[PDB]
Amino acid sequence: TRAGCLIGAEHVNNSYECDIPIGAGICASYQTQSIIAYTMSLGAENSVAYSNNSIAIPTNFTISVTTEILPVSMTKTSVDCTMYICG
Amino acid sequence: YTMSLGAENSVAYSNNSIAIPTNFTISVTTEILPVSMTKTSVDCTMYICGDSTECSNLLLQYGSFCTQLNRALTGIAVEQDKNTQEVFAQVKQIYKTPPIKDFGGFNFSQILPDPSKPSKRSPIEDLLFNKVTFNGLTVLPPLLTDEMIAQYTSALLAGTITSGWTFGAGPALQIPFPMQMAYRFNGIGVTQNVLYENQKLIANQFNSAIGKIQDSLSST
Amino acid sequence: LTGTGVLTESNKKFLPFQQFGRDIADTTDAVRDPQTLEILDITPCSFGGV
Amino acid sequence: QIDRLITGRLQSLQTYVTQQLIRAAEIRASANLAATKMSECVLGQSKRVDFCGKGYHLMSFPQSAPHGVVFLHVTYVPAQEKNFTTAPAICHDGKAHFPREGVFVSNGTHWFVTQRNFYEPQIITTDNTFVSGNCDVVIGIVNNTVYDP
Amino acid sequence: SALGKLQDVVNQNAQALNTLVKQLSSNFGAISSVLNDILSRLDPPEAEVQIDRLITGRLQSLQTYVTQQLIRAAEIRASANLAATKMSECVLGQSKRVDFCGKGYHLMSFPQSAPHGVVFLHVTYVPAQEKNFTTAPAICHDGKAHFPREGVFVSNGTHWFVTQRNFYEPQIITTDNTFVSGNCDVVIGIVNNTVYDPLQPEL
Ligand SMILES: *[C@@H]1O[C@H](CO)[C@@H](O[C@@H]2O[C@H](CO)[C@@H](O)[C@H](O)[C@H]2NC(C)=O)[C@H](O)[C@H]1NC(C)=O
Ligand SMILES: *[C@@H]1O[C@H](CO)[C@@H](O[C@@H]2O[C@H](CO)[C@@H](O)[C@H](O)[C@H]2NC(C)=O)[C@H](O)[C@H]1NC(C)=O
Ligand SMILES: *[C@@H]1O[C@H](CO)[C@@H](O[C@@H]2O[C@H](CO)[C@@H](O)[C@H](O)[C@H]2NC(C)=O)[C@H](O)[C@H]1NC(C)=O
Ligand SMILES: *[C@@H]1O[C@H](CO)[C@@H](O[C@@H]2O[C@H](CO)[C@@H](O)[C@H](O)[C@H]2NC(C)=O)[C@H](O)[C@H]1NC(C)=O
Ligand SMILES: *[C@@H]1O[C@H](CO)[C@@H](O[C@@H]2O[C@H](CO)[C@@H](O)[C@H](O)[C@H]2NC(C)=O)[C@H](O)[C@H]1NC(C)=O
Ligand SMILES: *[C@@H]1O[C@H](CO)[C@@H](O[C@@H]2O[C@H](CO)[C@@H](O)[C@H](O)[C@H]2NC(C)=O)[C@H](O)[C@H]1NC(C)=O
Ligand SMILES: *[C@@H]1O[C@H](CO)[C@@H](O)[C@H](O)[C@H]1NC(C)=O
Ligand SMILES: *[C@@H]1O[C@H](CO)[C@@H](O)[C@H](O)[C@H]1NC(C)=O
Ligand SMILES: *[C@@H]1O[C@H](CO)[C@@H](O)[C@H](O)[C@H]1NC(C)=O
Ligand SMILES: *[C@@H]1O[C@H](CO)[C@@H](O)[C@H](O)[C@H]1NC(C)=O
Ligand SMILES: *[C@@H]1O[C@H](CO)[C@@H](O)[C@H](O)[C@H]1NC(C)=O
Ligand SMILES: *[C@@H]1O[C@H](CO)[C@@H](O)[C@H](O)[C@H]1NC(C)=O
């Protein structure tokens, strides 16, 4: 492939969502048994039924709670160079 | 010369006078942002000593210096895929437009992918593509190729055109394009009746505004 | 002129007095053989991460 | 002599990596901005001024470009306007009427209520206004007739 | 592993620190990595050379460390600024920014303490079951074009209703739910219906 020479993985013509990325559109995964190589899928195909007079309106809803994790600070560390360099 | 900051334009202010627009135009502007850069990665050992054993043995006296440099570059290369995915892979599904591009007079032919080409990019994307161009180092490929970025873009465009903003906050829900626009007008304080009364004009101003994009990108 | 790499013949043309070629990066990429007046390209030995 | 070349080459490599790393942060910041612009202006309608083009944002369309993203921002831009006189309120019968939406304006002989970003006069009626306070408080209040449907 | 962003910053700084101290074991071309084995074995003018090799090497190592920490600190600053923004906009208020605080329509969020960071629980409204309806941009009544005051006109196949855009809760189309602008000959796709006037049966 373009990323390099991949040895031990079986290349297939079936696309899957990416699991272990290799590069240049190629990903690998473990199927159940062997490791396979494939061109990654970017998502399921979904054509909306577009029409000049058709609208879809939700009749129900759900409350979804998602978790976002952000770092705020790093270790407040320092070193005295005159001890580190010398001793 | 001393530069001008801009033309002088006083405002006809008065405590009992207001100006109100009587007409409008649809303006399309182009904003360009970098997302990623080449995933260049150079092996410190080869860069400094090549295949020389006598040199490599002295390079080792510097401990982890080469390890640190190799790791820093690896990290830089990795976040380039993160940057690309964070920007383009914002859609869970791949959306496509219908066979019949009837959007109420709104022409997206320079926005949507050209199906006749080996690389399915829009007339504008094709132009953008064309306009911008050993010693131990190598260059790694991106995870997402131009073809995959183009597909993500197509999905986002198809979603925007046939569903509106709903696909970005739940399931995609179809809506007539001119009706979507009416909501977008209402969203800026312009009563939705304005769009319908002027739908022909708006579609024409839009279509011209887009054609001008391809021309100004090519020209400058 | 020394180095390590792969020697291949190439369709490159040097002037009669030029002994070797050099790239934009000051890297030698071709040499005129001292006995046979023909030009050989030089490519690096393939390498990469595993 | 080899040690000297190692120091020089290691140092030039450190310079490269450091500058490359600083620039990487700049590209990352741009990518983060691009991601925000897409999620707010492509997957929604931004209310942020000049976030996605000059004018009132309607929509945008992303286009792929080598090493980046190009956004086509579609905005509503007011065009040719007119001078109208205005009043903060209208006095009908001892009561101060304010527009529910829009502004009260006059063409020199008649008062109308209209939306702010597009001139489209409406008859001032009790369904276009609301009442708050009497006619003796508002500065600049004018006398007109409010129509009861 | 979901909480990986905080673990990665903890490990990355810990690793940088460990890397720094391990450089004390390098000799950088010196006769010894141990300062005492230079001073005690070599005559002063010779010791002064080997010691400079260790000083230069260790100083360069420390400069590298500080530079990497300084760049990394900038990355953390950016994250902290984003976190501060999300808290002030999504915890102390209700964001109107799409995907700023979770996928879906933001309702609210709750901050949670975390080691060296913050975790936000974003509560969002996400539309679920949906149906297609026939729609129209306007309804034609007595030669006048009626537009929904706030909502969309839809049909279930036999009757037209005005429905709020984000939830299928249909209502009878009345003069209160609609406004009139222009006649029926301008709007493209206008349909014929009857607009109810609540006054009529009471007049
Ligand atoms: C959408 O716009 C494109 C132009 O950008 C139209 O394509 C042109 O059609 C005319 C015929 O009317 C040809 O002479 C031009 O050569 C075409 N130009 C290009 C670039 O193809 C297209 O027909 C429009 N679509 C609709 C439905 O009107
Ligand atoms: C509002 O402005 C538009 C243009 O932005 C006007 O439409 C143009 O009118 C001229 C005639 O004066 C024509 O030659 C152009 O071809 C029209 N352009 C388009 C896109 O239709 C429109 O008439 C103006 N309306 C009002 C009320 O002033
Ligand atoms: C202000 O607007 C009113 C209409 O809303 C103008 O009055 C009309 O003028 C037309 C002639 O152009 C007549 O045919 C109508 O019968 C008039 N209507 C009324 C109620 O008088 C009025 O002239 C405008 N004033 C100014 C200064 O332009
Ligand atoms: C609006 O109409 C009222 C009458 O309803 C005007 O009030 C009069 O103002 C004059 C001048 O101060 C007094 O002498 C009268 O006694 C007031 N009439 C009443 C019934 O109190 C008011 O001035 C008018 N406003 C404008 C701007 O014309
Ligand atoms: C559209 O909605 C109307 C109600 O607003 C439906 O009409 C009613 O149908 C029920 C049975 O489900 C009857 O018991 C009522 O008496 C009907 N009311 C009226 C005024 O007719 C109508 O059937 C729905 N149409 C479709 C295609 O679902
Ligand atoms: C809505 O109903 C009106 C009648 O109330 C329809 O108007 C007719 O339009 C045709 C075509 O131009 C004329 O030949 C008829 O004379 C009109 N009728 C009347 C009484 O004037 C209108 O076409 C209908 N619209 C829709 C979308 O159904
Ligand atoms: C997979 O695709 C290749 C072409 O890239 C084709 O030659 C091969 O026969 C295909 N294999 C199967 C099982 O379809
Ligand atoms: C060197 O000698 C060989 C014959 O053995 C001859 O073919 C070749 O051309 C000579 N090269 C030069 C540069 O004289
Ligand atoms: C409003 O009146 C001023 C003069 O007081 C004039 O300069 C300005 O151009 C007028 N604006 C419009 C929109 O007519
Ligand atoms: C505007 O100022 C004039 C004085 O020049 C004053 O007579 C008038 O009442 C004021 N109108 C408003 C609305 O403030
Ligand atoms: C919309 O209509 C199409 C048929 O044209 C149907 O396949 C699709 O499931 C409908 N959408 C919904 C939400 O029912
Ligand atoms: C919708 O498309 C149909 C053709 O399938 C056409 O007859 C009808 O007039 C169109 N309606 C609108 C509002 O464009």
From Swiss-Prot, chain B:
Positions of the record's site feature: Cleavage: R121, S122
Disulfide bond sites: C44-C66, C49-C55
Superkingdom, natural source: Viruses
Record's protein name: Spike protein S2
Effect caused by changing T138N: In strain: Lambda/C.37
Reported function: Precursor of the fusion protein processed in the biosynthesis of the S protein and the formation of virus particle. Mediates fusion of the virion and cellular membranes by functioning as a class I viral fusion protein. Contains two viral fusion peptides that are unmasked after cleavage. The S2/S2' cleavage occurs during virus entry at the cell membrane by host TMPRSS2 or during endocytosis by host CSTL.
Gene: S
Glycosylation site list: N15, N23, N107
Swiss-Prot record, chain C:
Record's subunit section: Binds to host ACE2. RBD also interacts with the N-linked glycan on 'Asn-90' of ACE2. Cleavage of S generates a polybasic C-terminal sequence on S1 that binds to host Neuropilin-1 (NRP1) and Neuropilin-2 (NRP2) receptors. Interacts with host integrin alpha-5/beta-1 (ITGA5:ITGB1) and with ACE2 in complex with integrin alpha-5/beta-1 (ITGA5:ITGB1). May interact via cytoplasmic c-terminus with M protein. May interact (via N-terminus) with host bilirubin and biliverdin, thereby preventing antibody binding to the SARS-CoV-2 spike NTD via an allosteric mechanism.
The species this protein was found in: Severe acute respiratory syndrome coronavirus 2 (2019-nCoV)
Protein name: Spike protein S1
Function: Attaches the virion to the cell membrane by interacting with host receptor, initiating the infection. The major receptor is host ACE2. When S2/S2' has been cleaved, binding to the receptor triggers direct fusion at the cell membrane. When S2/S2' has not been cleaved, binding to the receptor results in internalization of the virus by endocytosis using host TFRC and GRM2 and leading to fusion of the virion membrane with the host endosomal membrane. Alternatively, may use NRP1/NRP2 and integrin as entry receptors.
